Amino acid sequence: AWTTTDFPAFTEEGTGRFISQKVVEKGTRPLQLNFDQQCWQPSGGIKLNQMLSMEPCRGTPPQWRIFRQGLYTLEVDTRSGTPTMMISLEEQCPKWDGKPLTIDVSKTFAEGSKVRDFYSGNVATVSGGKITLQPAFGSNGLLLLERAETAAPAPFDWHNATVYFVLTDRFVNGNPANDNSYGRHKDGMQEIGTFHGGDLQGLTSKLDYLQQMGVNALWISSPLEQIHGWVGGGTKGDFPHYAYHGYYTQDWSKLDANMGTEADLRRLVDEAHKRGIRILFDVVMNHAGYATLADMQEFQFGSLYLQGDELKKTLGERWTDWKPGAGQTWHSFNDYINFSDKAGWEKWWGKKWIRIDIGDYDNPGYDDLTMSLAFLPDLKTESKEISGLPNFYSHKPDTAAKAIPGYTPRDYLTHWLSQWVRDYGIDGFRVDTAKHVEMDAWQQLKTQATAALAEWKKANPDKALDAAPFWMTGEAWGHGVMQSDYYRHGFDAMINFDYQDQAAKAATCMANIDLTWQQMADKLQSFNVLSYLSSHDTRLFREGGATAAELLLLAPGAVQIFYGDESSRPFGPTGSDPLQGTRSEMNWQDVNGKAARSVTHWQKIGQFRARHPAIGMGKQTTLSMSRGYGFVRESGEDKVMVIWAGQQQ
């Protein structure tokens, strides 16, 4: 095994990587790693949180400087053939002496039965109703206690679901060729609001990576055709804002060319299903995307104050190629647009389709349902008027949208979204802006989507994992843990905004979460929610030290990993929009290096959750113990005990 003087013997933490942890005092010492009589030492100096190249030991050992007392982790990685190593520091709460725990399991696991700590893989035999186990390096003092007969994931349940929420554009660029669809440009600045180039092909390439994390639902940003152009970014227009996040839809009937082809979507869904991963589309029915110079020029709608030679002089051959000059911002292009012109702006969606404070359109209302959210065109979902297609679709010959006798705007929207479910076997939707569209519209969407999936599963019996119905979760801003009227208008679970602040209060002491977990375990006996630490419209949860994984994945109800939670993806450039930094590029360089053991930690807790529906669905009994923190959860035949030894410092 791997050893160094004055550290315990290294133990495997993910295949081909071995770690050791110890509370080390301030000072200096030599650093060599031994495997049998093989000796290795850092060859290029010693820094924290960096992959250190190693050489066979020669002369005086490299001197490692301990600038701060704390729990240090040494990591050795043999997956490159030559050992590389890594050094990292973790600098009224139960305390842990770092030594083995004796656990009373007499009420949980049978006398003489074998119990596994899933995290370490250590197995103990129940004797006098007790087992003794050492929490493994990287466990943070957790024992994940299960019957040793546990061997593989339990049947999928939405009430035990591990959802991975990915902004496809900011994850993996599978094909650079499709990065600049419809004349879209990078800004050459910090790319705050641009298409980075992430696509469905790229996302498909990481399905094994997600499967290893115990992910069994993949929530993707809408892949449907967005506005082609940009608007002013943030409060100051310091960046161009493109529809990289999928929330500014223009054509519901087509895939966005940046995301890829129909074939790419079919491969993503089919390969995801092959690995027991359900697909959720992020969907919008509340609004279409903003008017952009790209779309105005392409589809011949709107009105400009620029007439004569002044037009091509100012905005150029392609208006979307305009950049702000001296004394201008990315909002300044609006100065050239005549938003008051009735005739010009009717050529866009048309008066029968949207509310907006432009031209001759129905004015937005002064309520959540009919307001124009952030000046977005509000789709008339409640309208009973037979609309025909949007006016500007007359200049969009590539659309799959067809006029249908008697159809209202809502009928088109529910038909368009349902057709993706029918054609590809999409397992569910995450519904955006749920509080801004009337309940009856969401019920219609659910009914048609349910029919669509049943039709696909019947037509594709080889591909269908089960006969489970279509699943729908919604973002109703500020929704908590309660069975609201949403649950009686087509929603199987609502996104839980309240978990984030409760997790934050347990960031420095995991045991603080107990009351929240007891409440949620009891409340969610009768319904389901989708809880998160991080989101695109809140913040990235990075205060948990190494404990974010257990804080999320041991929560009752369905849980949502925001892409990069597993790798501590940093908050990115944000400009004058405080939310933009949450959509930073996936940190793949860190995943394969300094965040490698974090990813392994997430994989272990994620896999434990996938084996045990009791976690997501079980009644909780919090244990009374003289040392540490512990609870049991039980759902049908499934029973687990989670022990947390406490803080090692």
Residues making up the annotated binding site for Ca(2+) are 173, 175, 178-179, 197, 199, 286, 369, 378, 436
* Alpha carbons 537 and 551: distance in angstroms, whole number: 20
If one asks whether residue 249 binds Ca ion (CB under 5 A), the answer comes out as no
Q: In the complex with Ca ion, which residue's Cβ is closer, 2 or 244? A: 244
Q: In the complex with Ca ion, which residue's Cβ is closer, 380 or 639? A: 380
Assigned token pair, 445 = 């969407």
Active site residue 475: yes
Q: In the complex with Ca ion, which residue's Cβ is closer, 378 or 638? A: 378
**Whats the size of the chain, residue-wise?**
649
If one asks whether residue 436 binds Ca ion (CB under 5 A), the answer comes out as yes
Give the distance from CA 204 to its chain's centroid.
Answer: 15
| Cα–Cα distance list, 649 to 8, 95, 388, 493 (Å) | 17, 7, 68, 39
CB of 54 to Ca ion, least distance (A): 36
- Among 187, 432, 492, 550, the one annotated catalytic: 432
* Alpha carbons 642 and 141: distance in angstroms, whole number: 10
Binding mask 361-380 for Ca ion (x = CB under 5 A): -----------------x--
| Choices 409-417, 435-443, 526-534, 591-599; region in contact with Ca ion by CB under 5 A | 435-443
Residue (of 318, 311, 218, 315) closest to 271 by Cα position: 218
Residue numbers 580-619 binding Ca ion by CB under 5 A: none
| Choices 176-184, 210-218, 471-479, 553-561; region in contact with Ca ion by CB under 5 A | 176-184
| Count of residues touching Ca ion (by CB under 5 A) | 9
Contact call for residues 103 and 117 (beta carbons, < 8 A): no
Angle in degrees, CA 564, 266, 220, rounded to 5: 25
* Alpha carbons 127 and 148: distance in angstroms, whole number: 15
* Alpha carbons 588 and 590: distance in angstroms, whole number: 5
Binding mask 145-174 for Ca ion (x = CB under 5 A): ----------------------------x-
Binding mask 76-115 for Ca ion (x = CB under 5 A): ----------------------------------------
Q: In the complex with Ca ion, which residue's Cβ is closer, 282 or 378? A: 378
| Choices 144-152, 190-198, 334-342, 609-617; region in contact with Ca ion by CB under 5 A | 190-198
Residue (of 121, 140, 20) closest to 76 by Cα position: 20
Binding mask 381-420 for Ca ion (x = CB under 5 A): ----------------------------------------
Q: In the complex with Ca ion, which residue's Cβ is closer, 139 or 168? A: 168
Among 178, 297, 418, 547, binds Ca ion (CB under 5 A): 178
If one asks whether residue 179 binds Ca ion (CB under 5 A), the answer comes out as yes
- Among 77, 251, 475, 565, the one annotated catalytic: 475
* Alpha carbons 554 and 511: distance in angstroms, whole number: 12
Q: In the complex with Ca ion, which residue's Cβ is closer, 354 or 610? A: 354
| Choices 88-96, 401-409, 429-437, 487-495; region in contact with Ca ion by CB under 5 A | 429-437
| Choices 118-126, 433-441, 493-501, 564-572; region in contact with Ca ion by CB under 5 A | 433-441
CB of 378 to Ca ion, least distance (A): 4
At 446, which amino acid appears? K
Active site residue 432: yes
Residue (of 431, 401, 429, 398) closest to 416 by Cα position: 401
CB of 260 to Ca ion, least distance (A): 8
| Choices 428-436, 534-542, 545-553, 555-563; region in contact with Ca ion by CB under 5 A | 428-436
* Alpha carbons 525 and 345: distance in angstroms, whole number: 51
Q: Residues annotated in the binding site, as ranges?
A: 173, 175, 178-179, 197, 199, 286, 369, 378, 436
Binding mask 264-303 for Ca ion (x = CB under 5 A): ----------------------x-----------------
If one asks whether residue 432 binds Ca ion (CB under 5 A), the answer comes out as no
Q: How many CB atoms lie within 10 A of CB 618?
A: 24
If one asks whether residue 199 binds Ca ion (CB under 5 A), the answer comes out as yes
Q: In the complex with Ca ion, which residue's Cβ is closer, 173 or 538? A: 173
Residue (of 517, 519, 482) closest to 497 by Cα position: 482
Q: In the complex with Ca ion, which residue's Cβ is closer, 13 or 199? A: 199
SS (H, E, C) 37-75: CEEEEECCCCCCCCCEEEEECCCCCCEEEECCCEEEEEE
3-state secondary structure of 373: helix
CB of 72 to Ca ion, least distance (A): 40
Contact call for residues 346 and 356 (beta carbons, < 8 A): no
Contact call for residues 93 and 629 (beta carbons, < 8 A): no
| Choices 15-23, 59-67, 196-204, 396-404; region in contact with Ca ion by CB under 5 A | 196-204
Which residue reads 């939310």 in tokens?
Answer: 579
* Alpha carbons 189 and 193: distance in angstroms, whole number: 10
CB of 120 to Ca ion, least distance (A): 41
Angle between helices 409-424 and 262-274 (to 10 degrees): 60
Contact call for residues 387 and 412 (beta carbons, < 8 A): yes
Q: In the complex with Ca ion, which residue's Cβ is closer, 170 or 436? A: 436
CA end-to-end span of the chain: 27
CB of 537 to Ca ion, least distance (A): 17
* Alpha carbons 142 and 120: distance in angstroms, whole number: 10
At 358, which amino acid appears? I
Q: Which residues form the interface with Ca ion (CB under 5 A)? A: 173, 175, 178-179, 197, 199, 286, 378, 436
The set of catalytic residues is 432, 475
